[PDB]
Structures are given as C-alpha cells and as structure tokens.
Amino acid sequence: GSRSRILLIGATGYIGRHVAKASLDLGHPTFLLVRESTASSNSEKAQLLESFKASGANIVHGSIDDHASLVEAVKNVDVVISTVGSLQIESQVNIIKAIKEVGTVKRFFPSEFGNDVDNVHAVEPAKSVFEVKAKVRRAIEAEGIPYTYVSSNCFAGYFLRSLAQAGLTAPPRDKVVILGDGNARVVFVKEEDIGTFTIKAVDDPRTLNKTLYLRLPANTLSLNELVALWEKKIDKTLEKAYVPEEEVLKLIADTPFPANISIAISHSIFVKGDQTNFEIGPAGVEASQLYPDVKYTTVDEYLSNFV
Template identity: 60%
Template sequence: MATEQSKILVIGGTGYIGKFIVEGSAKSGHQTFALVRESSLSDPVKGKIVQNFKDLGVTILYGDLSDKESLVKAIQHVDVVISTVGLSQLMNQINILSAIKESGNHIKRFLPSEFGNDVDRTMAIGPAKSEFAMKAEIRRVVEAEGVPYTYVINNCFDGYFLATLAQCETRLTSPPRDKVTIYGDGNAKAILNREEDIAEYTMRAIDDPRTLNKTVYINPSKNIVSQNEVVALWESKIGKSLEKTYVSEEELLKKIPESPHPLDLLLALNHAIFVKGDQTWFTIEPSFGVEASELYPDVKYTSVDEYLNQFVFQIALYSLVYQLSRNMATEKSKILVIGGTGYIGKFIVAESANSGHQTFALVREASLSDPVKSKVVQNFKDLGVTILQGDVNDHESLVKAIKQVDVVISSIGSMQILDQTKIISAIKEAGNVKRFLPSEFGTDVDRTSAVEPAKSAFAVKIQIRRAIEAEGVPYTYVVNNCFAGYYLPTLVQFEPGLTSPPRDKVTILGDGNAKAVINKEEDIAAYTIKTVDDPRTLNKILYINPPKNTLSMNEMVSLWETKISKSLEKTHIPEEQVLKLIQESPVPINVLLAINHSVFVKGDQTKFTIEPSFGLEASELYPDVKYTSIEEYLSHFA
C-alpha cells in the first residue's frame, strides 16, 4: 500500500507537535522526509530527536526556511508538505509557498502550521490575536497562490493543557491535587486532544480527497469538555475535592497586559478557549470543513478521561515507591536537604529519594508561589519526598525538621553560607544528627590560592568548617570541584548566549596546562548520597576526582577538536591579564573570573595529594558508580 501513499516532507519536525507528525508519518508507511537545520545536530535534545527519526527510517534533509535552494530541493522529493514551525517562524512559511510554486506545482497538498484554534473563527485578544492573525495571513496567501491545502485544527494539546488542567501560571507537570484556577465561569466547552492522535488524524487527511482545500477539525465527542467538567472528572479519580479559584473575565483581561511574555500569550489563549469558547461556538459547515472522528471512526483516540488515568497511575506508583523507600529506610539514614530547590540541591534531593532514603526537603513558604521553584517542589513530592516548610532564620522550624532525620545536607547558595551557623545551632539542640554535610560542592577551600573576590567567598566556607569542628558536629565535606553544567556546555567560555562548545575559536586562561576536575551534577549527587552512611568518610573530605574527569583546558580543547574534526583558533590569556580583568570586571563576572583563575590557571583542584588523614577519593571508594566522563559529556554536543 505504501506505493499509493504520498511522500511527505515535514518542516519543523524537531518542534513540539512536529516530532509526533514525523513519527506518525513514518509509522503509517509514508516515505517520510524531515528538513532539519544542521545546527540541530549539535543541540543535545534535538540531536536525539533526529536520531530517533533516522531509526524510524526517516530521510533527513539539511536545509533552512531562509535557504530557498534547500527548500526547493527538498520539496522536489515529495507530494505533500507539512509545516509545524513555531510561532517565531510563522511568517517564514511564505518562503515555503514560494518554493512549492518554484518546484513545479507538483505538490498535492500543503498543511501549514495551524495545529490550534481555527484562526478565522476566533474572538482572541492581545498577543493571541496577533499570533492568530499571522496564521490567517498565511491562509490567505496559500489560497491566493492556488496551492492545494488542508488546515488541521486540533484545538488544545493534551500535553500543554490537560496535563496541568490548564494551570498556565504554575509550571505543574501533572494535574493539581490541592487547588485549581478556573477561568470565567468554567462552563465554556473546549477540545483537548492527545498529540499522537492529532498526528494520526493528520496522516489520514493528507490523501483523502474529502479534505482537499478544507479545514479538518479534530473534535471527538469525548474530548469536548468544559473546565468545570475536567476538574470534576479529576476530582472523582483522586477521591478529593480541589479548592477552586474562579478568575472572572474582567480580572483576566486586566491580568493579560500586566503579565510578562510568554505568560501574557498563555493567558490570552486561555481567555479565548475557556472564557469565550472559541473552539466550540460555531457549527462546522460542509462548505469549509469536516470533522476528523466522523471521517475516520476507526481511529481509536484517547479520551480526556483515559488521558487523566495515567496520572492516577503515577500517584499509585509514587505511593508504592515511597512506601518501599520507607521500608528500606530502616537500614538507611533519613535525610533532610536544606536548599533543595537550588542548583545542586535538586539533584541531591532526587538522588536521595531514588536511592531509597526517606527524604525531607526544608522549603520556604515563598518557594511554593515561585513558578520555577514550585515546579521543583512538585517534582520532589512526586518522588515521595516529604516537604517541610521552614527557613534557616526560623530556629523552631529548623529544630523541628532536624529532629525527624539522621543526616542533614545543606546545599544553600553563596548568599546564605554564613546562615549555616544557625543550622549548626539547631543540630546541637536537636541532638540526634549522625552526619552534617555543609554547602561545599566546589573547590577545597582549605587548599586554595584564590584571589579576591573568590578568596572572600571561600573564606566564608572555611569559617563554617571551623564552626562545625569546634562544635563537635559529625561531618563530611563534599568537594566536587566544577559542575559540568556550568563549564562543559561552553568549554569555559564567557561568550554571551553561547549554549554549546565553540566551533571556531576558543579562549584559554593561562598556558592551559593546569588540571581541573569537572563532574556531572547527577554523579555528584550519587557520590554524595553514597557517603552519608559510610563510616570511612566520617569527619573527612570526600573528593570527587574521577580520573577521566581530571583534565587540563588544553586537553579538553583537544578532545573537542577531535570530536568535531576541526582545529579551533586559540587565544591564550596570560595570568597577568586575567588578574587585570578580574579587577576591572563588574559583579558577578569578577567572581567567576577569580574562580576560573584559581581552577584553570593556578590548578587549585589538583595541586595537592589527598592524604588519608583528611580525605578520600569518591571514585575509588564507590567504583560501582558509573560516572559520566568529560568525553562522554562532550559527545552530546558533537
């Protein structure tokens, strides 16, 4: 049958809905092509998507919307072109239309990037109105040029809206379990579809003469629901009533212009969908459209009810994992993490929970209303972590939290390092802690030749060490040296906007021969949790210095050059110039430069021998930890 099926080109296939469309095309037996920018291959996320396409038998064509020659060449391979480009590239679809015309008018069908509301039948306002206007403009050009088309209106993506019950102001990853915001009176009907189903209906439509020059609406009856109905359905599944906050239309209209981008766009979309009922206020007439589930009744789509079941299963699974963890915790220490919503803290909390420790996270009440931190906290809850509200400045909450555990790990940020004296005081009062790991997670501050302002930052950590020792609190200091996430994605470059290692030129501090140690955050967490119950590391320093992660800057650059098969132009900055730059740079650049001077010029992380009297090396103690080497980490960017 594949000989009768159209050959399909997807432009924008590495985007959100695009990857589902590409997979749906390939799995449906269509000869499938994906136009991909070469830069996508060096992106860790998109590179993985492209590899998945290849595994499915998709032909990868390299090109760009701004490169007409590559567009025409790609289009000449196929019968159908599907665009799934994002908001910022909507108007660039003019280039696709031009290329379709130039390729000889052999294209049987063009599907522009719609995949949302019907933009010709909307009452949207503000930023949503502007977005819809661009899509409407593309429609008019398609029609004026006489290009055969199908517009696919899938309405809402389940992954965007149903997974959070349309809570766009919170950053949830699963439906809320305590309170929910409802827009307007909650009675306007919306339509929510699973991404895989959208892809399947799209594939059905492209060779169907009934959908030629028509709008295909994906409006299956079981997926047409109001927000009130969705919330009630979720409540029935979890056996609990949620606290409901209704946001009136007037209040929402006021909030939209006051909100930063992209929240203003999300709120404007929610206004159109859940207040005005944009997706369901009109009747689909045969003159302009057809409904997908009526055309293709054999497609077994996922209903709203069925989609929500996966989250009920997750709750049960997390509960089971948590109970198992509690049972195992009889042999493992109970751990409290203070500063768990911070950079390294979230890795520590996750590893503690995943390792079977009964895990607690002390969280400030303000974090629960922070869009980013509240998402982290929700993830902790999903892992079975017990959230305790408190603050390092609230002695009572500290003592109460500490009394519930055996081990305290602090991962608070640089601005609160000295506040750890309050943790020490609370530990002394609680009287039950077997081990305290203060917020180190960097260079060994007792063995550094750092200059200002890094010297002062390290001195504060030294002060905490001495306070711990003077109070007789059992400890382990974790020295992980450099975070891979800070240094390796840019190969220690300060170039603004750089998100991957350079491919043309590189700056090297000093002569580039000083050895540094760089570790992946997940590995740091794994070694940290391994040490909490290890008597060998009691009152010692744990150095995370795996041999494959101990390299000089020159060695890292050489390794990267080998991976990309290209020599970089190297600029060495002598120590004298680095010291001058430190003095002339503003905060926090001066701090970063001073740390890099310590690490990559002075070699502070590797200039001494680890003696058994004060420390132990993690990869030797725990050879079963399969750490990620620098070479493996860089491979994601090659």
C-alpha cells in the same frame, strides 16, 4: 535502599536538586525544608518541588531563619545536607546551633560542592567567597558535629558544556580563550553524579569527618586536552587565545560584581590548578576509590552529545 532519614536544606538550588533526586533514588526518606513563597514570583522552583513530592519527598515547611522550624526538622533526621546559595552560606550557623541543640544528627554536609576551600590559592573576590565556607567548616568542627565536606569540583553542565568559556551554553566551534598555559588539570563531574556519590557517603565511616573529593580519573584533564578532544570530535581546529595570569588579574580588577567573582574562581581552577595541585591528606578521601561501583558519565561521553 539503606535506612537513614535525610533533611535537604536548599533542595531547589543548582546542585541541591540533584542531591535530592539521588537521595530518593538510593531510597532514603527524604525531607525537604521549604519556606513559604509566592509561586508565580518563583515559578521554576514551585514546579521543581511539585515534582519532588511526586517522586516521594517529604516536605517540612521551614526556614534557617527560624530556629524552631530548624530544630524540629533536625530532630526528625539522621543526616542533614545543606545545599544553600551563596547569599546564606554564613546563615548555616543556624543549622549548626540546631544540630548542636538536638544531638540526634549522625552527619552534617554543609553547602560545599565545588573547590576545597582549605586548599585554594584564590585572589579576590573569589578569595573571600571561599573564606566564608572555610569559616563554616571551623564552626562545624568547634561544635564537634559529625561532618563531610564534599569537594565536587567543576559542574559539567556549566564549565564542560561551555568548554570553560564564560558566556556559552554549548562548546564553541570557532574559537576558545585559554587562561594561563592551559596545562592545569581540572576535574569535571556531571551534576547527577555529584548527587549520587554525596548520598553514598552519608552513612559510610570512611567519610566520617572527612573531606570527600571527586577526583574522577576519566574526568581529570587540562583545557588544552579538552579543546583537543573536542577539535577531534568536531573535526576542525579552534582559534585560540592565550591569556597569562597577569592579564587575568587585570581583567578581575577591571570587571564589576558579579562577573569578577566568575573570573576569579576560573583563575583558581584554570590558572592555579587548585582542584589538582595538592594531595588528599589523612583527612580526605576520594569518591571513585570509595564507590568503584558507581558508573559516572565521562567527559568523552558528555562531550560526544554536543557533536
């Protein structure tokens, strides 16, 4: 179970909890940075930490708004994996200053785990959300810090489970709204799989100073293909609506915060096809060609459960 000491900053977040679990499962010494908080006011969180120290994670008590707790937690580790929320994507500049000041960190993974922000054709407000991450990448690069940018694409438990439908928690059995032509390919990855491939890249030299894509073969399809795989399984036809790009942009302009960020990320992904409309260059590498050994849940597998 390899050897390196990993620090998770933002362990209780949506993808952070899966990256933390797999850190423990491929057997590393896992450190979790935790800010002092009132636990009744932050219940599910306290309970998630409870279960991480029960699994064996080593809690460091800190904040990225405390350089002294950051430099300390960073001295202590080999790779730093940030999985913070959108509210503090820009505050990762603190983790960089501390990573710079310490010198002992072998690899920094910033909070990415979605689209590759240097290869999107996004419209506002999504265009600005992505530009905050891109700017942290240029700051990691300016410091000379060793990095891996994980571009894990679409969370299966959000987008696949909903069949890319804005409100849902289960695949619709009546109707779907397909944005654009429905032929842009997307890739969906189960969150627990995102956590495993991320932890497998930590010490590998093929992922040093690379963007790691998760372009998983069995998991790459268009919404047309996904609706058709599910009409088959549920053995009935869904009523469909087709929304062109122009009608999606009007929707974005006429929706307030935060739902306009949702619809604009969905234009980048489902209309523009931003997860699959560019080639992995010299500075990129793919997780299935790099770790062919990992068995990931396919879209057919994840969908058969909801049938």
